[PDB]
């Protein structure tokens, strides 16, 4: 019956994700207070991330139910590839629209002309292109069940280039940010806009810091209680379910096109 | 005997242990996809794979590396 109560668990959370990343894509491709404004790009290639990330909790369900693995080698390879690869971008996604933010707020003083697209699309094909080049290399590098042959160097490495440097490039780019506009009424688009991402990086960091710290705890030599781990394991995957209700929330032309 | 008790970052421990429990046992306990913890120390003979997790066992001195 717990194998039971798990699976439907993990397809409601699956059907969630994919719902909440759905609605949001076509809102963003849609309307008009977020199809004309191009930043929301970002948000729309997030939410795909997050959507196709529902290849990765089937399998792991699959694991925890069966106790075993049962798709081959080179299946567990690809599998435990693709399964950082998409935290790791999701993250330095996080960080390319702050990063893209502090430029902006940056190069107003030596003006710009509408060709906004093009600089969006451009970020976009460059953080998938830093996440797949920043997490397969340590990879590659380094009955049935899917394991890592590890040194305990790949540990480290994975939560660095995947956790601790992202969130400490973020955080040195929000305080220059907030510098910048100490130095120099109503809301506007740019703030609301500013203010989801801000709650949307907070849920993040809260989501996936317990399992990275851990983690970087069993590296480092600690022994970690088991279910605890796995449900800090788990809980990402919920931040990813999480995150549409973060833009419908908080923002309300989003919540009206997902009415429509 | 004289095996690997701790194996991580920041140095490799390698201990002996009282005598009755001479032989060293590596237990391999597998959480998620990429966490396989080992449990490295010394048994009389070898313990018990309980959940069924591979536990290589030794007789040797330094086998469970």
Redesign the interface.
């Known amino acids: 019956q717990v194998t039971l109560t798990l699976v439907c668990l993990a397809g409601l959370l699956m059907l969630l994700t994919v719902f909440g990343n759905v609605l949001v894509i076509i809102a963003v491709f849609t309307s008009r207070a977020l199809k004309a404004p191009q930043n929301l790009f970002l948000v729309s290639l997030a939410s795909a991330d997050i959507l196709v990330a529902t290849l990765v909790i089937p399998f792991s369900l699959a694991n925890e139910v069966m106790g075993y693995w049962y798709f081959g080698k080179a299946w567990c390879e690809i599998y435990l590839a693709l399964d950082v690869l998409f935290c790791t971008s999701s993250i330095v996604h996080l960080c390319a629209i702050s990063l893209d933010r502090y430029w902006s707020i940056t190069q107003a003083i030596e003006y710009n002309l509408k060709r906004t697209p093009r600089r969006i699309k451009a970020i976009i094909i460059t953080v998938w292109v830093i996440s797949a080049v920043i997490s397969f290399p340590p990879l590659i590098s380094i009955e049935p069940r899917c394991e890592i042959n590890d040194q305990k160097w790949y540990v480290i490495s994975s939560c660095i280039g995947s956790f601790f440097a992202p969130c400490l490039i973020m955080i040195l780019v929000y305080v220059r940010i907030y510098q910048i506009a100490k130095r120099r009424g109503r809301q506007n688009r740019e703030k609301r806009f500013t203010f989801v991402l801000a709650v949307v990086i907070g849920v993040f960091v809260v989501c996936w810091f317990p399992f990275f710290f851990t983690y970087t705890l069993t590296a480092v030599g600690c022994s970690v209680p088991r279910t605890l781990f796995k449900f800090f394991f788990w809980f990402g995957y919920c931040n990813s379910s999480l995150n549409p209700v973060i833009y419908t929330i908080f923002n309300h032309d989003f919540r009206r096109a997902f009415k429509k | 005997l004289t095996c690997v008790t701790?194996?991580?970052?920041?140095g490799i421990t390698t201990e002996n242990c009282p005598a009755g429990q001479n032989l060293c046992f590596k237990r391999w306990?597998?959480?998620?996809?990429?966490?396989?913890?080992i449990t490295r120390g010394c048994a009389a003979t070898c313990p018990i794979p309980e959940n069924?997790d591979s536990i290589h066992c030794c007789k040797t001195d330094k086998c469970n590396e």
């Not at chain 2, 701790?6 to 920041?10: C, E, L, S």
């Not at chain 2, 306990?29 to 913890?37: D, L, S």
Request: glycine share 0%; hydrophobic share 25%.
């Open positions: 701790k194996n991580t970052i920041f306990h597998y959480v998620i996809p990429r966490y396989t913890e069924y």
